[PDB]
């Protein structure tokens, strides 16, 4: 019984990691290494490194 | 005859000022579209947008 609940929690964990995304992009599912948001009018970026939770 | 001839010079100067006024009236909208184009490009540079926003 403990083994079955452990497997069910690991599957729910992978599902919740898959669903962590906003308008097709994410910093949690591991689909990308980083997202470069704007920092100034010249186009310099403010990098935010992705932190995979899968 | 010289004083009479000067009137054509004044007419040419006024015509040139009118032409430059038309060019500035076009330059207003050209600068505005250039500013909006820089806005669209600077927004498109972001990698967090999905493909539909970029399109």
Swiss-Prot record, chain B:
Entry's family note: Belongs to the bacterial flagellin family.
Top-level taxonomic group: Bacteria
Compartment annotation: Secreted; Bacterial flagellum
Annotated organism of origin: Caulobacter vibrioides (strain ATCC 19089 / CIP 103742 / CB 15) (Caulobacter crescentus)
Residue numbers of the full-length protein present here: 56 to 110 of 273
Name under which the protein is recorded: Flagellin FljL
Subunit: In C.crescentus, the flagellar filament is composed of multiple flagellins of 29 kDa; 27 kDa and 25 kDa.
Function per UniProt: Flagellin is the subunit protein which polymerizes to form the filaments of bacterial flagella.
């Amino acid at each position: 019984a403990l083994k079955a609940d452990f497997e069910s929690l690991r599957d729910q964990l992978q599902k919740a990691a898959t669903n962590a995304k906003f308008n097709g992009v994410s910093l949690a599912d591991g689909s990308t290494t980083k997202l470069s948001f704007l920092a100034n009018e010249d186009g310099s970026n403010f990098t935010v490194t992705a932190q995979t939770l899968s | 005859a010289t004083a009479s001839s000067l009137n054509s010079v004044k007419d040419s100067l006024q015509r040139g000022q009118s032409t430059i006024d038309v060019a500035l009236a076009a330059g207003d909208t050209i600068t505005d579209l250039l500013t909006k184009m820089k806005e669209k490009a600077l927004a498109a540079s972001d990698t967090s947008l999905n493909t539909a926003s970029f399109n």
